[PDB]
């Protein structure tokens, strides 16, 4: 809790197209649609590898030390559906405004806003622990033509073998009860 | 080195820094509890991974060492402290533009010296995120802008996590000379001593 989930109109019913400025940026930077939704683009992957213990009795797997991506939400596709990661993820706000909703394994729900107006409780830099489900949606905002741009750094570096989607609203019901699950259903597959 | 090469051109602020920072920035400094950094500017370590990693460090001949997997930082340049003075780092550092505008000046051990601008107006060669290879000396300075009241705020991620052994900062222009023509160095002097 803390933020109050109130999806703008384009969040509930996404728009067919994003404003042209966001289109430009999308094409110039060659961002692509992510599995979760929104646009992204891995811009860095450490040349350094590191061995890491991973449960299968565990097993050693090797990953890059770190990975960086640009992640962008837009009226075009404003939601980044509920997904979980093995490693902690660092998020750095760059432009616009958005909101995050985290579902902890014990079933606790947390939601907060991302933006540069810290006085009004807007975070511009946040970390979400591995194992914690997360989703985020675009918040309307001028200043960045209704867009939301952030940078993400994963350590060890991202690897889909470490990524897992919330299995629909079902598993949501299991985690937060039906009444809450229903509320956050728009953020899941 | 894909960043568009930029023209090193300070402003009144840079060469003749202000006495105190402008109210809005000063307020941010107080609220976020940012401290003036050794190399200049203000900062704060926001996140230091609880998870660790063993890394091999030289002392040829080397030896293992434990490091936090990563460190996060808020770095801000203001008209009263507009320069991030030249300094190296064993590891690569990821930089992410957040507010304001600025310019970076790098000096590779080959003597090679690139310089680019940080801003969101990429249609003009400005970059919003950049990685500086360990080993390279980096300096940065403030660029007048209105969006962020002449401030320049970025975030830096270091992995392995920052340790003082990983840090060093060239002194005076002498070392700057034996890295760049004593001439080209003269120009890049305000980012040194
Ligand atoms: N580098 C990356 N590649 C794919 N999905 C990601 N999610 C976060 N970072 C990612």
UniProtKB/Swiss-Prot annotation, chain B:
Gene3D superfamilies, sorted: Jelly Rolls
GO cellular component entries: cytoplasm; nucleus
GO biological process: pyrimidine-containing compound metabolic process
Official protein name in the record: Uncharacterized protein YML079W
Pfam families, alphabetized: Cupin_5
InterPro entries (alphabetical): Cupin_DUF985 (IPR009327), RmlC-like_jellyroll (IPR014710), RmlC_Cupin_sf (IPR011051), YML079W-like (IPR039935)
Species of the source: Saccharomyces cerevisiae (strain ATCC 204508 / S288c) (Baker's yeast)
